Amino acid sequence: ERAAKCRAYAKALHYKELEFQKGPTPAILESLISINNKLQQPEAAAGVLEYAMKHFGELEIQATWYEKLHEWEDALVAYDKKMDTNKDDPELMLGRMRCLEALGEWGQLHQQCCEKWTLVNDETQAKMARMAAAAAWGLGQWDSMEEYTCMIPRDTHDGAFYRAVLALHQDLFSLAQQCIDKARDLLDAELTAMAGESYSRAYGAMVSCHMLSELEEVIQYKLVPERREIIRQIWWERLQGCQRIVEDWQKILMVRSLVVSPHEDMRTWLKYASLCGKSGRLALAHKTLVLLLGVDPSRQLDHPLPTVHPQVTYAYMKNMWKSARKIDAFQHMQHFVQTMQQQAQHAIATEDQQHKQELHKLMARCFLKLGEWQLNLQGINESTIPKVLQYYSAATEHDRSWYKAWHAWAVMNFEAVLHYKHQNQARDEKKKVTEDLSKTLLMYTVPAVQGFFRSISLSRGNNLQDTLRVLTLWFDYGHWPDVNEALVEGVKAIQIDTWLQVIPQLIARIDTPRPLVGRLIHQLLTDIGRYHPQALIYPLTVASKSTTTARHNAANKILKNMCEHSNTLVQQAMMVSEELIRVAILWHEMWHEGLEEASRLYFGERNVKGMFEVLEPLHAMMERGPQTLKETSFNQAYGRDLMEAQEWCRKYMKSGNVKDLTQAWDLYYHVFRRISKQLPQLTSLELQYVSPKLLMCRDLELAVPGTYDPNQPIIRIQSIAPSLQVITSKQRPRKLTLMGSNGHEFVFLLKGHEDLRQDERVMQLFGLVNTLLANDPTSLRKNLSIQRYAVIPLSTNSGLIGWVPHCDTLHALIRDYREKKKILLNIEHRIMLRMAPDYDHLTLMQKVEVFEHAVNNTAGDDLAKLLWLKSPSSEVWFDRRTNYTRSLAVMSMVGYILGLGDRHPSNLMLDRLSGKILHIDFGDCFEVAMTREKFPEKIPFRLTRMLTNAMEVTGLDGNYRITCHTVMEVLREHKDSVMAVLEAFVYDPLLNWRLMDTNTALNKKAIQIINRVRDKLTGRDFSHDDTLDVPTQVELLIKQATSHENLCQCYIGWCPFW
């Protein structure tokens, strides 16, 4: 029944929304927030209110909007403005009061009640009493409570509840006992009266039901003396665990207040105040602590802080920092620590070890904050550098363990290193200089390394940032003995596991010319070979076949080393990767492109020295002789022609003719035409012709490409599917499919001529961003994640790509709908061309019209509409949407940071089962797409029209935007871990090629890209000078992604109308 109730609500919401489509009215708008409420979709509905505001200032009073937007603090001073400008107005008071009772302002709420009691209005007399009852409850005065309770009817759950509290104070137990059960049944029948269309009052009934069973433990805590620990435990666990926004917990503690004074709870109230500060209610949190201190809202302001409760003071201190007064905060910290170390050293009479310990750990938190704040107040220069290092080392001493302490110290040293480096490149722009620098850097490099090492061991399974940082120092310091020893120490010290995170970065530096550096890499790589090979073979196999000598060389040693230990696995992996690259581009396929290229250099460029370079390896490639049936059947139909076609080429080399050379091209154009014919006839490949070795493979010990992780039983290639569908494309990728030794099937994409290594690092970055999202509670609350896939490079040319199930490209999904609804696929396109035949050359202004015109004569439904027709139910439909919107918003923001261009309709797809979005192809990263010459992108991420449509109406206002700043919040918080990863493949030695394509040293270019990334993570992306906070940045971004002006410029294939 219950699962069947939300169904009808979802289905009605569909039509309700499609009605709002037809005409946006306040009538529907009312019946929309409400129906989305029932569907316990809080934020989506909140977006309905954002629209309600932006188009109807019409349930009026900006204090009524601030109140419905639960912005009590905004609605209060709005109501103050509204009441002092106006008159009494019975309603304006009720609102002014509700704000207080949510803020927990019992001081003012009680006063506002008594001090204003003409209230000739009798409804004004009825509500009145409920608020002032609790106000008095909050302020002790039980007399006022009873007075105001005597005015609350015993029919209301409220009236029956406040009787239970007043009883429990005066110790009338079986009174309170019965008052509980009456209020229960008054609320049971009350959750059936407002059956569905109520406030957060079915969500706040859980606030009442919680309070009532808790109030039954307050009962338990009165006569029978033996749950004082049991009740406090559940009270404590169901707190750090429980997550109810500030306001509920006030009331919850007020119940517990009948029983335990804050001075015995302390940890409880500190934890609570802790949440008030984090959530952003400092004025409240302050009042929590002032009570706990038992001393002033430091009205005595020039006076020292009281060390009475070392824990409480520290909280007050950091509350003061987070508050305005932050120079004042720093000052009370220095002194607090001084007092604390003296309260330790002298006041510790041995039989006091626990207090000494907890005292020492609180101190380390203090030093951390002291250094943090010094950096915040002064920045990084010759005076602060040693002082904060002093602070951090001090924190390191007092806790020894603790990730943050060691980390903070490493980063300080590493930024000390950076500070001088970047000061010295500054010097060089305008011999004793280098020596002092050498000693300077050596002084800070070695601690940095050491710190990062003790930090990593304290992170375990969560150290990617630190681990890479170790590498920056390792790789970046062409090694001075001092640094190398520190590294060698760490290598021995820290677990092997660690380095798996980092393997491609390491392999990018096998052929390291720096000799002390290289040794350690190789030795470490071999150790990583000893425990978990598998994690090594695939990548090492790639490296060992590499034009660059020193690379493949040093790679082979490691493999050799691994054979004395895991030989057939090395041999298995060897052959599998070998065979797969054969299957990727077949002999004739390589010949076709080669013949196209050769005809461009010669017939269209007059370049025979380039042309010969094109053909010669193709001839040498076959000189080795055929190796598979497919290779021989080409050799017959074409071989003789080509072998003699090269003969004419080599008669010209020596003769220098042009008639010798035209006999060759005579032969070359023959096979070309033959192959071009057989090309659209490649729609399948049978293994037994193409690679029999792969058909042979049975129950191997090689693990299914990119499945292996420790923790997880190794999944091996038990067999290969005998046929590979050839996805007919310009690069004809193969649908290779594998059999798991677990039983399940694994599908891949064998890609011929695309350097896949970039997408690997991108997937790596993603993994991190996934972690971060799983770790932010809010992002975890909403299931925010990036749908990722396995990327296994096989050379510079080829590689494998994990094939996510249940996914169709946006483009595909449309092409079906369009043909099914008898719409010409490229209808928008044709409209445009008919209007402006010279479209690509119009002025921006002209383009915007042609564009707008095309949009106004086409359905924006499509996507939205087919995802409704797909859904088997309606609740399924709804979730698939909630999924889609969130997941898309994620990769809108991440996509931005990575500078992800080229997001056309065949480059993102939708999981038809969950609705979650998925991005493929990560070639155009960083501003690259926008920097290009012809058809530059003006878009940050595709937020195209049929996407928007497919969300809830009130889309960008609802889930999308919220999810946007939620994700973006996380990213800015963790800006450094994210920058570690990115820096790591901007300056990756082998991957620097994607930036010299601005042409169709790099040191300078690379720096920019990385700054650009920081700018984006520090709200400086737009204007240099401003520092935009998240929601602004977000707003600005959504704007840029939506501008017709931007979209009409997008190259037509990108489909800026889809």
């Binding site: 209007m835 402006a836 035949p837 010279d838 050359h841 921006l844 202004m845 019209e849 015109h853």
Partner: protein
């Protein structure tokens, strides 16, 4: 065709530039303008030949030889060429390109090169020449209006509201008023300090008109200096009183039911000599002759296959 007292020219995306006979709606000659749409038409003060500012070229056909093909092309400039303006004494021409430059062209000489260049950040949408022939007003996509002193080469800039691209600018024959129209849909009016001859020539802001909701595409003063016209993407030409700055006559091509999705943008306009009539360029492939006072459609010049973005009009003796 340049022999008829009234020259009326029409261009657009249909690869022709068509000449019409004012008083009838009959098309005289048509010339081939292929490979590009036409961004701007202006008839030289000399009544000898007309200019077609296009994509990376300025083609110039002849009103006198009544037949042939482009007398002069001006190439070697990337991105669109947006505005054309001539200087009374024959041999000068100005342009504002998407290549962010304002260029001075010597008409009585060779070279696809130009005698001068003024360069800004952001594309230049419009270029017009102060009556005194000594200063050029240049408005770009950032929203800056530049005054270029053709003698002192002294760049002097002024942004009004803009972070918004300013679309066209004009200045009344009497040199008393300058006006600039932007993409928000606003129209800014300044009062001209007639420094001139040993020059100062300053600008004192007078009014902002909320001319339109959609893109405002062009503005133009009547020869009178009585009226100011505003063409817009809201499919409307609005004619305002210089005395009040109040709206006097509105011209529009807005369907007749909300469910039409527009059809036609009001690209350009040109007043008659006596300031009694106004001509209109629209994307619905038609030019239009209106009575400025009654707002009456007195003629409809239909002929272009594809849209119209360009007008040229002439009244000289």
């Amino acid at each position: 065709v340049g022999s008829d007292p009234v020259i009326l020219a029409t261009a657009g995306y249909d690869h022709t530039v068509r000449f019409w006979q004012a008083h009838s709606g009959i098309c005289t000659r048509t010339v081939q303008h292929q490979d590009s749409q036409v961004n701007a038409l202006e008839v030289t003060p000399d009544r000898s030949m007309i200019a077609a500012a296009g994509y990376q070229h300025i083609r110039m056909y002849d009103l006198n030889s009544n037949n042939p093909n482009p007398i002069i092309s001006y190439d070697g400039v990337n991105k669109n060429i947006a505005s054309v303006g001539f200087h009374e004494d024959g041999r000068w021409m100005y342009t504002g390109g998407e290549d962010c430059t304002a260029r001075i062209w010597d008409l009585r000489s060779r070279n696809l090169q130009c005698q001068r260049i003024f360069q800004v950040n952001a594309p230049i949408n419009c270029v017009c020449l102060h009556p005194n022939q000594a200063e050029l007003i240049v408005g770009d996509q950032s929203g800056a209006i530049h005054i270029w002193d053709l003698k002192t080469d002294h760049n002097e800039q002024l942004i009004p509201e803009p972070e918004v691209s300013i679309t066209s600018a004009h200045i009344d024959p009497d040199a008393s008023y300058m006006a600039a129209v932007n993409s928000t849909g606003n129209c800014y009016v300044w009062n001209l300090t007639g420094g001139i001859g040993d020059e100062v020539t300053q600008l004192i802001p007078k009014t902002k008109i909320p001319a339109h909701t959609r893109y405002a595409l062009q503005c133009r003063f009547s020869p009178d200096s009585t009226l100011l016209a505003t063409c817009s993407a809201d499919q409307t030409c609005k004619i305002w009183r210089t005395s009040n700055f109040s709206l006097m006559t509105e011209l529009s091509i807005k369907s007749g039911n909300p469910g039409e999705s527009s059809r036609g943008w009001m690209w350009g306009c040109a007043f008659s000599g006596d300031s009694q009539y106004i001509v209109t360029a629209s994307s619905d492939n038609l030019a239009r002759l209106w009575c400025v006072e009654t707002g009456e459609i007195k003629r409809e010049y239909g002929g272009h296959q594809k849209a119209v973005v360009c007008l040229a009009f002439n009244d000289s003796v």
